[PDB]
Amino acid sequence: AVADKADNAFMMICTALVLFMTIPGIALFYGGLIRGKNVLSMLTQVTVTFALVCILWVVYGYSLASGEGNNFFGNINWLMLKNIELTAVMGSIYQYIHVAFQGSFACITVGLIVGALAERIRFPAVLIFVVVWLTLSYIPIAHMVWGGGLLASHGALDFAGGTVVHINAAIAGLVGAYLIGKRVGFGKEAFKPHNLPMVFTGTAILYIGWFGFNAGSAGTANEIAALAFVNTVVATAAAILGWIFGEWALRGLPSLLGACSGAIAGLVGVTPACGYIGVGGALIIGVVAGLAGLWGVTMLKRLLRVDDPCDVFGVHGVCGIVGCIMTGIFAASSLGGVGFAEGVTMGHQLLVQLESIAITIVWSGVVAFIGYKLADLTVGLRV
Amino acid sequence: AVADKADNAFMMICTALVLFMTIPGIALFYGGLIRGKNVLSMLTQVTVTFALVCILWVVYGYSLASGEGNNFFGNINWLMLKNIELTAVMGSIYQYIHVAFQGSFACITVGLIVGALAERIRFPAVLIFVVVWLTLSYIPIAHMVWGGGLLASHGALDFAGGTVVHINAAIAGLVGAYLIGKRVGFGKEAFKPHNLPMVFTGTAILYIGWFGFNAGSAGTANEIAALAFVNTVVATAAAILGWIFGEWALRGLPSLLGACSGAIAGLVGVTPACGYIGVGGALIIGVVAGLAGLWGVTMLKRLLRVDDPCDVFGVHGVCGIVGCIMTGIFAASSLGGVGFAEGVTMGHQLLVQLESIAITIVWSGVVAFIGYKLADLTVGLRV
Amino acid sequence: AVADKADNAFMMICTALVLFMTIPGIALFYGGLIRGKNVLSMLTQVTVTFALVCILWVVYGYSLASGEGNNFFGNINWLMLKNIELTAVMGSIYQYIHVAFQGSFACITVGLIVGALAERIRFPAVLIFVVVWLTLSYIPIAHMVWGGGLLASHGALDFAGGTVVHINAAIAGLVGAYLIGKRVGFGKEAFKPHNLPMVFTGTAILYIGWFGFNAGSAGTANEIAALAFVNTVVATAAAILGWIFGEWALRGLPSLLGACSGAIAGLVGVTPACGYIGVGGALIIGVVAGLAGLWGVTMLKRLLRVDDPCDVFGVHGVCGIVGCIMTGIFAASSLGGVGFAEGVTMGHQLLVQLESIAITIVWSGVVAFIGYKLADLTVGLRV
């Protein structure tokens, strides 16, 4: 078709915002959660894997994720963006912008994993893992949800990536935490308060960039982008309050980490639902995501028993799941949502959401497992 | 009417930029002005009150601030954005974007107050204060200036919030500093130089986000937005130089805090004038605001005698006043400005500006007083 | 003509992004490369010189850089933007936005110089230097390349400033490092690892802002902006990998500084080429720029023998040169590029690129020399 310059502008900026989430958003976020001794290594890994993803994305990621093919992957007709005229239009923007925007999603997804595990994984091993997981889990899942694949064919609702990004990364990260052990130094059993301002800063950058992430997922600066934008503001706020309220009632006082985690919880929770729900639904999903996230990390604490950056996956995983399920409810017009597809009832949509979640969890988990093992067998995983 | 996607795009990005001012802009700004021992508490308060404002805004703030009603407040027909079709257009953008943009202003305004006072106010108390002050001071004043209220009816010129944001927050903050005492630890009588890079960083983020704040106030990516943008660059630069020049002549040397304060001084000063003045007027307002800000904080130092984050209110208050008054002068075409409204002379405009300033100061001061007292009587103000 | 609001929106945001590169991008970048004892002074100098540039730009910079005149400078018909109607259109955006966008380039260029040298130059001296160098080197070179001057007339290809910004600043900075000595404290012979996260953060901000820098150089949110955007993502990623690969093979391990330097190397390298090359060309230029940058700083280390913020100029200078030369190759359609101008062959384009590089190096070097000497003779250069 013909590109709308307003959409081109909106989408390029949204892409920059999503890139901002990884560089430096997620890096600063984790920077404040890990011991100073491993910060440089983590930042190096996040930066290098970010570069790797950017390259793999243009080389074949975009083609296999967005190209037309089957239910699990696209094709290789767009390797290095070959056959894509610069003036080619995807939706209402130049396809090149579509490439960049989708690539930025691959980046933050990988950043979520690497930022948490970098400190316990060999550099060469993380590179191998990223290649394997990006290629076999991210790309296929991205194709399944946004590339007209299996999940999209089943009518799975996921506006900005509750599955593709959050659940996908959460499971990969948790498998990594499961396979790769980490010696907790004496006196380092809890996140160091002094470094928390960096967590706040990273959270802030993730939040601001998330507007490009959520609203940009509309692919145009229209009313849906506006809705997604407002719902992002609302769900985040509601989750911050939900988490802080729960924390206050559970610990007697709010904490900075709680407030930040609440923000992430709402952002993750609203990710799949933002363009399909009403503001009231966003507020409810936010509150529930905030409380669910608190519950999740509390549960992880029982397993780990110590503060660990991988606790982040508890939020992305639990809140991603909660958000995806909740989207199946709040997408209803009776609830101020956009509506379900033709012939779809809330009950059916919920089942589809659950199916999408289950497939994503198993798919990412299996691929992550293979990735870590391949890395271990080849160069060795653990630092 | 019909939404212009270019404006939708511009305004959503501008909204993200304004949100960036609070999260993490103002938090980092104050983070570098308070003692490390209170940074976490301040960040938590800024984050939670930010969430609270976001929610209150959508619940009733937007309706009471922008809905049509009387001279002081709107209506409750838009509670939770009810009755607002997603495709509803306000100006040339979807109303939902208008909601978000205006909400971001409420956020930075509250952030300005909370960031400075958080360290000396009980958490539960700040929540009560925000509810009271946002509801009774911010919303009414916002309605008076941008909601077709009293001040707008009198022709008060305030492009981006010299009154609604800066003077409003400054008075609320100063009343808080007046009512809530703070024990200055030994050796903590001056801002710690080591933390100043954070003040710079916060200032930088506030500056960049301020473009969304000022230019976005045009409500469209037009020539007025362009003017506001250029004037923001110019006034800020002129104020940095004005402050640094004054500081140099007063102390014999420039300082980082002086440079940053100068930037804020110009940003605040040009806020009400940016879309109504010429670049020459912006340069003059900038220089004067920079010098006025320096004068203001110097005066506050005589009362406080110690460096305190609340010194920030001296800049927002004095520069807000200076900017609002100066707008009444430089809006003149003889001076390269846009012009005064029908039948308006510079003398009359100046009186209107003064009236707006006086009303804002008294209104915010009274409401803030009530807010702090209610908080004190209920849960206790002081930490 | 008539302004396109989508382009207005895109360009104002891109301008904000470019400003973000200086405030606080480059400041944080250098903040992590200099000793804590000089950070405040550097930040003050970067902030004040930034303000100075902003003012000089509107006063006469824009007029002399973009006004029509001769091969080396424009005119003074636009002093303080006089004679520029607010509704005046330049390209497809309001001229005022053009003024702001170009001004932001002047700012980051000066920021690149000041951030590195501030710690060793007297404050009054840096002000004098900036006035001299901005006025006689930046403005003329900007006019020569983007103001229809000498280089543009010869068909020099430089999409976003390989010459105007990077080479120009690099030579000015290196001349400064040559003329101004710096005593290296004992134990401060290598960059302090503890401050490197700030370098990463600055690099990240520079990277994100660079999208406004490169894509905004298209002057419209079109397919060229999209191309530039994608090539920026790709070249940066390729350079990060190229540098890290070289570093790994040279030192046995990657480093955070290496990863960050690689990013800057790719960003600089692709700056002149981004809107003229294909993604494959961007990947190749990125890899080469990354390796060239590593080579460059390695060479500077042999001359300096110690880590120094001025090492940054090795990257901007070498990568700027490499990028400008490479643009003469990859602009070819056989290589996926846009094409050479009428009657131009690759060989001729390469010669033109070399001429542009040579002129920029000599021009900036001579002017910088004069600037530093004038400052030295008047107030004294060295701290």
User: Which residues does C243 contact at the CB level (< 8 Å), separation at least 6?
Assistant: C258, C259, C261, C262, C265, C290, C291, C293, C294
A104 annotated ligand binder: no
* Coil, strand or helix at A90: strand
Backbone angles phi and psi of B333, in degrees to 5: -65, -35
Whether C245 has its CB under 8 Å from any CB of chain A: the answer is: no
Closest by alpha carbon to C146, among C216, C227, C44?
A: C216
Q: List, in sequence order, every residue forming a beta bridge with B94; answer none if it has no partner.
A: B89
Alpha carbon of A1 to those of A7, A87, A91, A186, B152: distances in Å?
13, 10, 8, 61, 45
Q: List, in sequence order, every residue forming a beta bridge with B121; answer none if it has no partner.
A: B382
Sorted by where each starts, the structural domains of chain A and their CATH numbers stand as 1-383 (1.10.3430.10)
Cα–Cα dist C177/C28, whole Å: 20
Whether B110 has its CB under 8 Å from any CB of chain C: the answer is: no
Cα–Cα dist A142/A147, whole Å: 6
Q: Which residues does chain B have within 8 Å of residue A227's beta carbon, measured at their own beta carbons?
A: 86, 96
Omega within 30 of 0 (cis) for the link into C197? no
User: Which residues does B64 contact at the CB level (< 8 Å), separation at least 6?
Assistant: B73, B74, B75, B76, B135, B139, B140, B143
Whether A237 has its CB under 8 Å from any CB of chain B: the answer is: yes
Closest by alpha carbon to A133, among A149, A158, A110?
A: A110
Interchain pair B58, A230: CB under 8 A: yes
Alpha carbon of A336 to those of A283, A342, B76, B87, C199: distances in Å?
12, 17, 19, 14, 46
Cα–Cα dist A347/A364, whole Å: 26
**Residue B295 distance to chain A (closest CA, Å):** 32
Experimental method: X-ray
Q: What's the residue count for chain A?
A: 383
Whether A54 has its CB under 8 Å from any CB of chain C: the answer is: yes
Identify the residue whose tokens are 């340069």.
B283
CB atoms within 10 A of CB C149: 23
Whether B253 has its CB under 8 Å from any CB of chain C: the answer is: yes
The enclosing H or E element of A47 equals helix A36-56
Q: Report which DSSP code applies to C341.
A: P
**A319 near A289, Cβ under 8 Å?**
yes
Identify the residue whose tokens are 């280390």.
C301
Query: In terms of CA atoms, which chain C residue is nearest residue A7?
Result: C6
**B176 near B115, Cβ under 8 Å?**
no
Cα–Cα dist A356/A141, whole Å: 10
Whether B83 has its CB under 8 Å from any CB of chain A: the answer is: no
The enclosing H or E element of A177 equals helix A168-179
Closest by alpha carbon to B208, among A186, C27, A261, A65?
A: C27
Interchain pair A208, B23: CB under 8 A: yes
Both structure tokens of B342: 């029908």
3-state SS string for chain B: CCCCHHHHHHHHHHHHHHHHHHHHHHHHHHHCCCCHHHHHHHHHHHHHHHHHHHHHHHHHHHHHHHCCCCCCCCCCCCHHHCCCCCCCEECCEEHHHHHHHHHHHHHHHHHHHHHHHHHHECHHHHHHHHHHHHHHHHHHHHHHHHCCCHHHHCCCCCCCCHHHHHHHHHHHHHHHHHHCCCCCCCCCCCCCHHHHHHHHHHHHHHHHHHHHHHHHCCCCCCHHHHHHHHHHHHHHHHHHHHHHHHHHHHHCCCCHHHHHHHHHHHHHHHCCCCCCCCHHHHHHHHHHHHHHHHHHHHHHHHHHCCCCHHHHHHHHHHHHHHHHHHHHHHCCHHHCCCCCCCCCCHHHHHHHHHHHHHHHHHHHHHHHHHHHHHHHHHCCCEC
Alpha carbon of C338 to those of C144, C223, C332: distances in Å?
22, 12, 6
Nearest to B20 among A9, A208, A283 (CB): A208
Q: Report which DSSP code applies to C219.
A: S
Both structure tokens of C50: 């930034």
β-pair type (A93-94, A89-90): antiparallel
Give the dihedral of Cα atoms A214, A219, A224, A226; nearest 10 deg: 60
Interchain pair C48, B229: CB under 8 A: no
Nearest to A48 among C4, C226, C259 (CB): C259
Q: List, in sequence order, every residue forming a beta bridge with C349; answer none if it has no partner.
A: none
Instruction: Report the first-to-last Cα separation within chain C, whole angstroms.
Output: 51
Whether B59 has its CB under 8 Å from any CB of chain C: the answer is: no
* Cβ-based contacts under 8 A for chains A and C: 153
Identify the residue whose tokens are 């986000």.
B209
Alpha carbon of A234 to those of A274, B96, B239, B292, C116: distances in Å?
10, 12, 36, 38, 42
**B108 near B271, Cβ under 8 Å?**
no
**C75 near C68, Cβ under 8 Å?**
yes
Which chains, if any, share at least 3 CB pairs under 8 A with chain C? A, B
Both structure tokens of A55: 């390259």
Q: Which residues does chain C have within 8 Å of residue A5's beta carbon, measured at their own beta carbons?
A: 4, 6-7, 10, 220-222
Q: What share of chain A is helix, strand, coil (3-state, %, to 5)?
A: 75, 0, 25
* Coil, strand or helix at C382: strand
Cα–Cα dist B67/B87, whole Å: 17
What ranges in chain C are assigned the alpha helix state H? 5-20, 27-31, 36-56, 62-66, 95-117, 123-133, 139-146, 150-153, 168-179, 196-216, 223-251, 256-270, 279-304, 312-330, 346-378
**B218 near B224, Cβ under 8 Å?**
yes
Q: Which amino acid is at B180?
A: I
Work out whether the CA dihedral C326, C332, C335, C337 comes out positive or negative.
Answer: positive
**Residue B179 distance to chain C (closest CA, Å):** 34
Which chains, if any, share at least 3 CB pairs under 8 A with chain A? B, C
Q: Which amino acid is at B92?
A: S
Helices B196-216 & C36-56 angle (0-180, nearest 10): 30
Helices B223-251 & B196-216 angle (0-180, nearest 10): 150
User: Which residues does C73 contact at the CB level (< 8 Å), separation at least 6?
Assistant: C64, C65, C139, C140, C143, C147, C149
* Coil, strand or helix at A20: helix
Between residues 168 and 227 of chain A, which touch chain B (CB distance below 8 Å)? 193-194, 196-197, 200-201, 203-205, 207-208, 211-212, 215, 220-227
* Coil, strand or helix at A190: coil
User: Which residues does C129 contact at the CB level (< 8 Å), separation at least 6?
Assistant: C121, C176, C368, C371, C372, C374, C375
Query: What is the CA angle C117-C123-C124, rounded to 5?
Result: 125
Closest by alpha carbon to C196, among A204, A39, B198?
A: A39
Q: Exposed, middle or buried: residue B349 (CB in 10 Å: 0-12, 13-18, 19+)? A: buried
Cα–Cα dist C221/C4, whole Å: 10
User: Which residues does B334 contact at the CB level (< 8 Å), separation at least 6?
Assistant: none
Q: Report which DSSP code applies to C121.
A: B
Whether A81 has its CB under 8 Å from any CB of chain C: the answer is: yes
Cα–Cα dist C56/C358, whole Å: 27
**B254 near C48, Cβ under 8 Å?**
yes
Query: What is the CA angle A50-A55-A57, rounded to 5?
Result: 95
